[PDB]
Amino acid sequence: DEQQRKRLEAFLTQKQKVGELKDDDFEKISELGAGNGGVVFKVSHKPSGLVMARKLIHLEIKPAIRNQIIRELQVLHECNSPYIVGFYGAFYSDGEISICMEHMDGGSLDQVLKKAGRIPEQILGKVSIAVIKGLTYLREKHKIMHRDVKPSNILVNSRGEIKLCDFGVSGQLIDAMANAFVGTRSYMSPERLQGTHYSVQSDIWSMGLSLVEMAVGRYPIPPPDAKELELMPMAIFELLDYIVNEPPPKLPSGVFSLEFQDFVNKCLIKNPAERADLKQLMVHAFIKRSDAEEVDFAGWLCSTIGLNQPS
Amino acid sequence: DKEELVQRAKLAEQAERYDDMAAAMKEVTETGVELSNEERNLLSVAYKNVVGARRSSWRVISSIEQKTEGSERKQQMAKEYRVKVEKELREICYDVLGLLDKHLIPKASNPESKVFYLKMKGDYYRYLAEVATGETRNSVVEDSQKAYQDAFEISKAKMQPTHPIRLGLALNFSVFYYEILNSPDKACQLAKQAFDDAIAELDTLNEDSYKDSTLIMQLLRDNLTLWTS
Amino acid sequence: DKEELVQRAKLAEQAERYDDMAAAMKEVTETGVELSNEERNLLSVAYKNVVGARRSSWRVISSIEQKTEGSERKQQMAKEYRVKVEKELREICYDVLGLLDKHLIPKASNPESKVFYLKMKGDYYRYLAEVATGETRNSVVEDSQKAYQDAFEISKAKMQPTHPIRLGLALNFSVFYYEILNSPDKACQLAKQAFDDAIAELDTLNEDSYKDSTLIMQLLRDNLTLWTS
Amino acid sequence: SPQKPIVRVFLPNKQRTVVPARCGVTVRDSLKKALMMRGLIPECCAVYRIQEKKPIGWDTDISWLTGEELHVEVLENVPLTTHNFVRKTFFTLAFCDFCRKLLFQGFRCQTCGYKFHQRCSTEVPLMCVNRDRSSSAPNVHDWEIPDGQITVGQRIGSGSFGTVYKGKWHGDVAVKMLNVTAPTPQQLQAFKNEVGVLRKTRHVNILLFMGYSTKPQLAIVTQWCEGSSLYHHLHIIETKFEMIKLIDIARQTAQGMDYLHAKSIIHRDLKSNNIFLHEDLTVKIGDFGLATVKSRWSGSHQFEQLSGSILWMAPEVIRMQDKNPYSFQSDVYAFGIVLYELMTGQLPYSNINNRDQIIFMVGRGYLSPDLSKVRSNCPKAMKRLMAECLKKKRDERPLFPQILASIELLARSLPKIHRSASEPSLNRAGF
Amino acid sequence: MTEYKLVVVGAGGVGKSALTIQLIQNHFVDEYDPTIEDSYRKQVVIDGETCLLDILDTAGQEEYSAMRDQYMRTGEGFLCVFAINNTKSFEDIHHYREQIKRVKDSEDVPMVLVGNKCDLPSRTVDTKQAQDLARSYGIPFIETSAKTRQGVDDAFYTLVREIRKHK
Ligand SMILES: Nc1nc2c(ncn2[C@@H]2O[C@H](COP(=O)(O)OP(=O)(O)NP(=O)(O)O)[C@@H](O)[C@H]2O)c(=O)[nH]1
Ligand SMILES: Nc1ncnc2c1ncn2[C@@H]1O[C@H](COP(=O)(O)OP(=O)(O)OP(O)(O)=S)[C@@H](O)[C@H]1O
Ligand SMILES: Nc1ncnc2c1ncn2[C@@H]1O[C@H](COP(=O)(O)OP(=O)(O)OP(O)(O)=S)[C@@H](O)[C@H]1O
Ligand SMILES: O=C(NOCCO)c1ccc2cncn2c1Nc1ccc(I)cc1F
Ligand SMILES: [Mg+2]
Ligand SMILES: [Mg+2]
Ligand SMILES: [Zn+2]
Ligand SMILES: [Zn+2]
């Protein structure tokens, strides 16, 4: 709209003020989070005064592959959407790949979910809207697919924005990522565990698998116990075997409306083609309803984190 | 009497003692008795293993000789030990070649056996060509060229291209071209021709001839794959 | 010079030839100088492989002799070949014993070397025991018994329960008990006691001998499992 | 329709099967198991697509054929290879490939190198895939560093259970800040007990373990290695070496692992990252054991949450369904993947752009290291060892006493066997 | 001389394929590779008759029931398999029998009830339940373990005998 265009243009304006990205141009302010393969810091770019997030991935790869990754990561300069985290520049130094993005002071939805215990359906509606619009922008404007949709990659700020990040834009970077340490849980759609990406359908499952996890405050595989649900250590290979050979998870009986439950069930179909696409979800009853609702996302976020109300 | 010596040769083969089998077969062929298939195959295996063990020993000795040249006169005795090994290598091949000159070649009433004996002569000449250097190498290889060229014709004219003896002859000739004359393109072309001819004429073999020919063809495929790269 | 002879012996060992190696080490021992730790292993390996080839030949020949089960001259010739290879093995073992009891055993400062050489003496007396059937068997059997008891006293006195030499002596002694004397109860008792005592000091395993220790341990376990059935 | 893009396959003798049409999988591998159940092998068969019967290559990517019907037939062509068994006495240390016991006398396949006792002939593999005398004696051939001593220097890099720094402690050492920063009094005790064992290891191929330090959290102190790791020399610079040095590296790694297993220490982490070339000559394995500092505890239990590059984890380790998956055979599988990495120069599964996909398919027994990327001169005996190390069932994998011996057996026969083949001896066998 | 078309049906995971592979090759598969379709031939002597068995091993996953139904239409007799640790698979024997009646357009179809996985601990479908269900349909009940091979031949041979009775 108008405010989104304003913010995008202001981000571009603040982006032109940044030239070459040198390692000496950053002063480390704080740590923001860490995963199994990278560490992110909030830092200040001295030459331009801006404050950004800097992800550092430490890969032991040959210099040619590293350079091709660096070159491929420059496509992120084209991604300009209110549902995609802003990108300032990527480079390599001191044996680590550094990716510079805009700072989301609200954090990722995993941290917000940990702070909140559970997330209300009404908030989840706007979250799903943003996720779907970001996936649409990635599928249409760039013909690339996220492939790593989960609460750890959905970011939010104090201005009520909800943006996607950590999507698969550099194929060589994914190829390097295939030599990673085993995680504790997977959001991979069942077809990807036996075949290859079935287009954006393979992303949508993850979103659903995320929403339920945010809907209940618990990793939904295996589904909660009979009395753990009323209270409202599986091996990773066992989780994958459950994902492939067991019925998908579902929302609780009566805690959530039927449109949200139908949305998540359509999002969690084990057959990707029978599973809904972006256009189906965009005009879903739950999506229409949550788009009609005037939910105060920024204030709810600030409240949950423990900061004073914004605006 | 003959059967007693053949039984002794078989018993020596089972006992892994090979020099006794070599002697017991040389004394059998010394008489000039009609040599059948198994009787000559025992001789072939005996004279193959006896020379093969010493050839492997010579290869190891030569490899150790060239491990480190920047050293004292420890290589001095190494080459003299190798010379002794050759002194115990060439003369047995000469005992085989003289034997082939005595009885085998004249007392042959079947072209297949003639091809077999000529291939053996060529194989032992190729065995001698490795250690022999200078003009002796040339003098040795000039005999093996004709030994194989007087056998390939008979193989092509009297026996099928799928015959295990013809396949063995082609394999040995390709190895001779590759290792001695160092013409890898001609060796590859010869091997490809033999293998394509074998494939073009297949599924006609006997029931017994379903292991050995396959073995030679699989070794041919291994060599072709090794020489392509 | 001794180093030239030792290098020649090692070179022949790397060439998989065990006739020049045995002669070279016999010439080394004939000098009458005390061997080092390294030089002894080459002698042991050479005079083990030389006997081992004849042992394999003898085993397979006796198997064929027990397989034929007929009435002809094949059995008589097989018996003649068996007595020939038995005479050859007797000559080898007698040469080893003559080279052992005149230059090494009487001059052995290190008790460890004494245990090694008494183990070898018992091993070759057992090698002679398994072939010679008759009245002479009781002499060599008792000689091996005396040698092994003498080695075992020193092993119990001044040896480690995890040393390769003590474990090898115990293994050879249990095999001697089981095969020659046919008393498996005491063989099992000895094997279990030795295996337990080797289990005792399991932590004390330096780099010098970990492969030999665990290999003899596993061989003892395999023999124990074979004999307890 | 595609129904999980499947392919329908018609088989000999009126049989049939459905296989998943997954990108990146060959027809051969899609069908391997179905054929095996019927005593068939792709190499003894032909495959066709219906279009009407048109021949396709066994190495075709099956995902191109989704929705199609394939047919597999035989033509009774080359019978793979028949075992050329020669009776041989082994004057050197040899083990029977079936029974893993000492093999003083037996049979050897001239082509494929398989070795077995006379008594085990009923257990020999059928296709040559390219009262007895009891055995005898074979041939003969407080550790806590206090504060104020470890000069922690420059950060080197983070791992799967800690970050490594180059420290100064009576010379250059490698300090490791273990991720487990707050250990319980039981985990600390178990870690001290594990260090008790690790301090008593001294081998030329094993990195020296110089204790730890408790005051500044937990910090394993190991011998600092100069030069670079094997992974660095195999995937960063891609400096391939002659086969002799490669087999020597494999032999030294196997010797170090054999020393580790002789003392009953499961490495749990053997991979090209933990293999160093000390002065470009000596192989040194590091980061072994330390089972108690991985999989952070919640009490007196140490449920292994599993952590490490899954490329080297055995299928039994990937499953984690077993009570304890880090046994000797999982170490052997890790070594086998190291052998594959050394031999081909590429990491396993160089055609997959997902990590969870690899975990699922490997732990499921569907994905295996492809053995069609090897060099065109590797002796078949050597390659057979690598294929034995990567057996899905862990009980089939050999132990390191056998692997070291098998490596050394072909280490000496390398130069002679590199020349072209020759006319072999005929059958000369019978059972 | 005599060919018999046998169809193995029942819920996912109960051991249909493991039972079939034990019959065909005397080997237990411990992996769980879900079936879409698999057919086998095996020649066997049963009651003095050399029999050619066509074994049609079907999918337990209902997603592939269209393929299952094509196999069922050709079959002459049915092994209806449940697992002794899966009560729903036991209850759903009724579903499979109804499917057979539907596809065969007949209430008179040779059938044998098989309770598999009897080697497991903590069995939850008891012998009385299973025998009562078999009795309710007038069919034999055979306990099996594809792991130990107990009952495998009896299950298939009994079905062949039921087909012979029906012929
Ligand atoms: N312990 C045990 N496991 C068994 C037995 N029979 C099958 N299984 C196991 O159960 C799993 C499923 O077996 P399978 O034969 O594939 O079952 P299915 O009924 O054919 N499944 P689907 O309907 O999907 O084709 C496999 O892991 C198999 O090893 C048995 O008798 N005992
Ligand atoms: N742009 C960002 N701004 C602020 N924090 C961020 C940003 N990107 C990532 N983070 C933090 O880093 C973590 C998520 O990033 P990653 O660690 O890369 O993802 P992850 O948790 O490792 O899961 P993955 O990517 O599926 S392996 C969270 O703790 C976030 O708070
Ligand atoms: N003993 C050592 N001496 C010298 N450098 C070392 C040593 N151990 C590790 N390193 C270095 O540390 C870097 C990364 O740290 P590590 O944690 O050892 O990596 P890692 O081996 O992948 O981790 P794990 O736990 O073994 S999977 C490697 O690239 C090595 O260069
Ligand atoms: O970040 C990644 N994986 O997580 C690290 C493991 O801890 C990641 C994974 C795949 C990928 C392909 N192309 C870039 N890729 C990534 N990077 C990345 C992408 C977009 C944004 I906006 C920010 C990023 F950091
Ligand atoms: Mg992330
Ligand atoms: Mg099935
Ligand atoms: Zn073979
Ligand atoms: Zn055996």
mmCIF file of N, CA and C in Angstrom, chain E residues 12-71:
data_model
loop_
_atom_site.group_PDB
_atom_site.id
_atom_site.type_symbol
_atom_site.label_atom_id
_atom_site.label_comp_id
_atom_site.label_asym_id
_atom_site.label_seq_id
_atom_site.Cartn_x
_atom_site.Cartn_y
_atom_site.Cartn_z
ATOM 1 N N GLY E 12 -1.627 -51.494 6.910
ATOM 2 C CA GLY E 12 -0.214 -51.178 6.772
ATOM 3 C C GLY E 12 0.592 -51.685 7.950
ATOM 4 N N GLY E 13 1.736 -52.286 7.643
ATOM 5 C CA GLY E 13 2.710 -52.640 8.651
ATOM 6 C C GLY E 13 2.496 -53.967 9.336
ATOM 7 N N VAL E 14 1.447 -54.709 8.987
ATOM 8 C CA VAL E 14 1.151 -55.924 9.743
ATOM 9 C C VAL E 14 2.106 -57.060 9.411
ATOM 10 N N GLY E 15 2.840 -56.963 8.312
ATOM 11 C CA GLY E 15 3.797 -57.975 7.934
ATOM 12 C C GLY E 15 3.445 -58.782 6.705
ATOM 13 N N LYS E 16 2.578 -58.261 5.830
ATOM 14 C CA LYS E 16 2.213 -58.978 4.607
ATOM 15 C C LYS E 16 3.438 -59.301 3.758
ATOM 16 N N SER E 17 4.294 -58.302 3.545
ATOM 17 C CA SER E 17 5.458 -58.529 2.690
ATOM 18 C C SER E 17 6.481 -59.430 3.371
ATOM 19 N N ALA E 18 6.710 -59.245 4.673
ATOM 20 C CA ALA E 18 7.650 -60.112 5.378
ATOM 21 C C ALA E 18 7.191 -61.565 5.357
ATOM 22 N N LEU E 19 5.885 -61.800 5.507
ATOM 23 C CA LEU E 19 5.366 -63.157 5.388
ATOM 24 C C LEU E 19 5.612 -63.717 3.996
ATOM 25 N N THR E 20 5.326 -62.905 2.967
ATOM 26 C CA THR E 20 5.491 -63.355 1.589
ATOM 27 C C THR E 20 6.949 -63.666 1.289
ATOM 28 N N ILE E 21 7.864 -62.796 1.723
ATOM 29 C CA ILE E 21 9.276 -63.022 1.436
ATOM 30 C C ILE E 21 9.809 -64.226 2.197
ATOM 31 N N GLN E 22 9.283 -64.502 3.392
ATOM 32 C CA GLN E 22 9.664 -65.737 4.073
ATOM 33 C C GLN E 22 9.207 -66.962 3.301
ATOM 34 N N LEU E 23 7.995 -66.921 2.748
ATOM 35 C CA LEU E 23 7.535 -68.024 1.909
ATOM 36 C C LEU E 23 8.435 -68.207 0.685
ATOM 37 N N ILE E 24 8.767 -67.108 -0.004
ATOM 38 C CA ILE E 24 9.450 -67.184 -1.300
ATOM 39 C C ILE E 24 10.927 -67.500 -1.125
ATOM 40 N N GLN E 25 11.593 -66.833 -0.176
ATOM 41 C CA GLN E 25 13.048 -66.873 -0.113
ATOM 42 C C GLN E 25 13.610 -67.267 1.245
ATOM 43 N N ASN E 26 12.763 -67.569 2.235
ATOM 44 C CA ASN E 26 13.229 -68.029 3.544
ATOM 45 C C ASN E 26 14.129 -66.991 4.216
ATOM 46 N N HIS E 27 13.764 -65.720 4.078
ATOM 47 C CA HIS E 27 14.533 -64.612 4.625
ATOM 48 C C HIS E 27 13.570 -63.624 5.270
ATOM 49 N N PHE E 28 13.940 -63.105 6.441
ATOM 50 C CA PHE E 28 13.140 -62.105 7.140
ATOM 51 C C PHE E 28 13.652 -60.710 6.811
ATOM 52 N N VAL E 29 12.766 -59.843 6.329
ATOM 53 C CA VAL E 29 13.091 -58.437 6.097
ATOM 54 C C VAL E 29 12.772 -57.639 7.360
ATOM 55 N N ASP E 30 13.790 -57.001 7.944
ATOM 56 C CA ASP E 30 13.540 -56.175 9.118
ATOM 57 C C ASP E 30 13.247 -54.721 8.774
ATOM 58 N N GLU E 31 13.590 -54.286 7.568
ATOM 59 C CA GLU E 31 13.205 -52.956 7.138
ATOM 60 C C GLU E 31 11.711 -52.915 6.839
ATOM 61 N N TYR E 32 11.165 -51.706 6.849
ATOM 62 C CA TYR E 32 9.753 -51.457 6.578
ATOM 63 C C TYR E 32 9.715 -50.623 5.299
ATOM 64 N N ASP E 33 9.559 -51.318 4.176
ATOM 65 C CA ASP E 33 9.453 -50.699 2.857
ATOM 66 C C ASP E 33 8.004 -50.840 2.419
ATOM 67 N N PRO E 34 7.168 -49.814 2.567
ATOM 68 C CA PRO E 34 5.737 -49.995 2.291
ATOM 69 C C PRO E 34 5.483 -50.413 0.853
ATOM 70 N N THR E 35 4.542 -51.334 0.688
ATOM 71 C CA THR E 35 4.233 -51.876 -0.626
ATOM 72 C C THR E 35 3.282 -50.958 -1.384
ATOM 73 N N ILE E 36 3.556 -50.770 -2.673
ATOM 74 C CA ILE E 36 2.563 -50.259 -3.606
ATOM 75 C C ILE E 36 1.962 -51.385 -4.427
ATOM 76 N N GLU E 37 2.813 -52.200 -5.049
ATOM 77 C CA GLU E 37 2.368 -53.474 -5.606
ATOM 78 C C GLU E 37 3.570 -54.386 -5.795
ATOM 79 N N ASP E 38 3.368 -55.670 -5.532
ATOM 80 C CA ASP E 38 4.439 -56.645 -5.664
ATOM 81 C C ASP E 38 3.806 -57.999 -5.904
ATOM 82 N N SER E 39 4.231 -58.682 -6.957
ATOM 83 C CA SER E 39 3.742 -60.026 -7.195
ATOM 84 C C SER E 39 4.923 -60.976 -7.341
ATOM 85 N N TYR E 40 4.681 -62.236 -6.994
ATOM 86 C CA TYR E 40 5.711 -63.255 -6.907
ATOM 87 C C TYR E 40 5.144 -64.562 -7.420
ATOM 88 N N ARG E 41 6.025 -65.424 -7.905
ATOM 89 C CA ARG E 41 5.663 -66.793 -8.236
ATOM 90 C C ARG E 41 6.566 -67.738 -7.461
ATOM 91 N N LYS E 42 5.995 -68.834 -6.982
ATOM 92 C CA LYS E 42 6.749 -69.827 -6.226
ATOM 93 C C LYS E 42 6.142 -71.194 -6.504
ATOM 94 N N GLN E 43 6.968 -72.157 -6.897
ATOM 95 C CA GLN E 43 6.507 -73.522 -7.084
ATOM 96 C C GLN E 43 6.748 -74.283 -5.790
ATOM 97 N N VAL E 44 5.729 -75.013 -5.335
ATOM 98 C CA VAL E 44 5.794 -75.704 -4.058
ATOM 99 C C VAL E 44 4.901 -76.930 -4.118
ATOM 100 N N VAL E 45 5.331 -77.988 -3.438
ATOM 101 C CA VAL E 45 4.533 -79.201 -3.316
ATOM 102 C C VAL E 45 3.646 -79.049 -2.090
ATOM 103 N N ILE E 46 2.338 -79.196 -2.283
ATOM 104 C CA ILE E 46 1.371 -79.106 -1.193
ATOM 105 C C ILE E 46 0.447 -80.306 -1.313
ATOM 106 N N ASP E 47 0.437 -81.155 -0.283
ATOM 107 C CA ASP E 47 -0.402 -82.357 -0.269
ATOM 108 C C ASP E 47 -0.171 -83.220 -1.505
ATOM 109 N N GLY E 48 1.094 -83.355 -1.889
ATOM 110 C CA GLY E 48 1.465 -84.197 -3.004
ATOM 111 C C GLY E 48 1.286 -83.593 -4.380
ATOM 112 N N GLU E 49 0.758 -82.380 -4.481
ATOM 113 C CA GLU E 49 0.530 -81.723 -5.759
ATOM 114 C C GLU E 49 1.581 -80.641 -5.949
ATOM 115 N N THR E 50 2.231 -80.634 -7.113
ATOM 116 C CA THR E 50 3.144 -79.548 -7.432
ATOM 117 C C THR E 50 2.303 -78.340 -7.812
ATOM 118 N N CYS E 51 2.442 -77.268 -7.044
ATOM 119 C CA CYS E 51 1.552 -76.120 -7.100
ATOM 120 C C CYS E 51 2.383 -74.949 -7.611
ATOM 121 N N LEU E 52 1.833 -74.145 -8.523
ATOM 122 C CA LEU E 52 2.430 -72.858 -8.861
ATOM 123 C C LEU E 52 1.629 -71.786 -8.138
ATOM 124 N N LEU E 53 2.249 -71.124 -7.173
ATOM 125 C CA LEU E 53 1.576 -70.073 -6.423
ATOM 126 C C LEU E 53 1.919 -68.725 -7.031
ATOM 127 N N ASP E 54 0.896 -67.961 -7.395
ATOM 128 C CA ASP E 54 1.049 -66.546 -7.699
ATOM 129 C C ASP E 54 0.657 -65.810 -6.436
ATOM 130 N N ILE E 55 1.607 -65.116 -5.828
ATOM 131 C CA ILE E 55 1.346 -64.368 -4.602
ATOM 132 C C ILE E 55 1.247 -62.897 -4.962
ATOM 133 N N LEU E 56 0.093 -62.308 -4.697
ATOM 134 C CA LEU E 56 -0.173 -60.904 -4.984
ATOM 135 C C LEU E 56 -0.151 -60.177 -3.647
ATOM 136 N N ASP E 57 0.943 -59.484 -3.375
ATOM 137 C CA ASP E 57 1.163 -58.795 -2.111
ATOM 138 C C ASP E 57 0.723 -57.347 -2.276
ATOM 139 N N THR E 58 -0.273 -56.932 -1.502
ATOM 140 C CA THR E 58 -0.922 -55.653 -1.746
ATOM 141 C C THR E 58 -0.498 -54.583 -0.742
ATOM 142 N N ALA E 59 -0.831 -53.345 -1.083
ATOM 143 C CA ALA E 59 -0.568 -52.220 -0.199
ATOM 144 C C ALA E 59 -1.536 -52.223 0.978
ATOM 145 N N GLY E 60 -1.003 -52.031 2.186
ATOM 146 C CA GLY E 60 -1.853 -51.717 3.318
ATOM 147 C C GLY E 60 -2.279 -50.267 3.337
ATOM 148 N N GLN E 61 -1.469 -49.378 2.771
ATOM 149 C CA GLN E 61 -1.839 -47.965 2.726
ATOM 150 C C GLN E 61 -3.023 -47.764 1.790
ATOM 151 N N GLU E 62 -4.118 -47.219 2.332
ATOM 152 C CA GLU E 62 -5.351 -47.073 1.567
ATOM 153 C C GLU E 62 -5.198 -46.135 0.381
ATOM 154 N N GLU E 63 -4.190 -45.257 0.401
ATOM 155 C CA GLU E 63 -3.909 -44.410 -0.753
ATOM 156 C C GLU E 63 -3.748 -45.232 -2.023
ATOM 157 N N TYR E 64 -3.262 -46.469 -1.898
ATOM 158 C CA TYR E 64 -3.026 -47.343 -3.037
ATOM 159 C C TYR E 64 -4.081 -48.431 -3.151
ATOM 160 N N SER E 65 -5.271 -48.201 -2.589
ATOM 161 C CA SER E 65 -6.301 -49.232 -2.622
ATOM 162 C C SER E 65 -6.800 -49.522 -4.031
ATOM 163 N N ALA E 66 -6.695 -48.569 -4.962
ATOM 164 C CA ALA E 66 -7.085 -48.862 -6.337
ATOM 165 C C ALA E 66 -6.214 -49.964 -6.920
ATOM 166 N N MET E 67 -4.912 -49.917 -6.638
ATOM 167 C CA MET E 67 -4.018 -50.983 -7.076
ATOM 168 C C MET E 67 -4.332 -52.287 -6.359
ATOM 169 N N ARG E 68 -4.572 -52.214 -5.050
ATOM 170 C CA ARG E 68 -4.977 -53.390 -4.293
ATOM 171 C C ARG E 68 -6.198 -54.045 -4.917
ATOM 172 N N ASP E 69 -7.196 -53.241 -5.295
ATOM 173 C CA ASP E 69 -8.428 -53.805 -5.839
ATOM 174 C C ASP E 69 -8.192 -54.522 -7.157
ATOM 175 N N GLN E 70 -7.255 -54.036 -7.974
ATOM 176 C CA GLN E 70 -6.947 -54.740 -9.216
ATOM 177 C C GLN E 70 -6.342 -56.113 -8.937
ATOM 178 N N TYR E 71 -5.467 -56.205 -7.931
ATOM 179 C CA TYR E 71 -4.916 -57.498 -7.536
ATOM 180 C C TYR E 71 -5.992 -58.400 -6.951
#
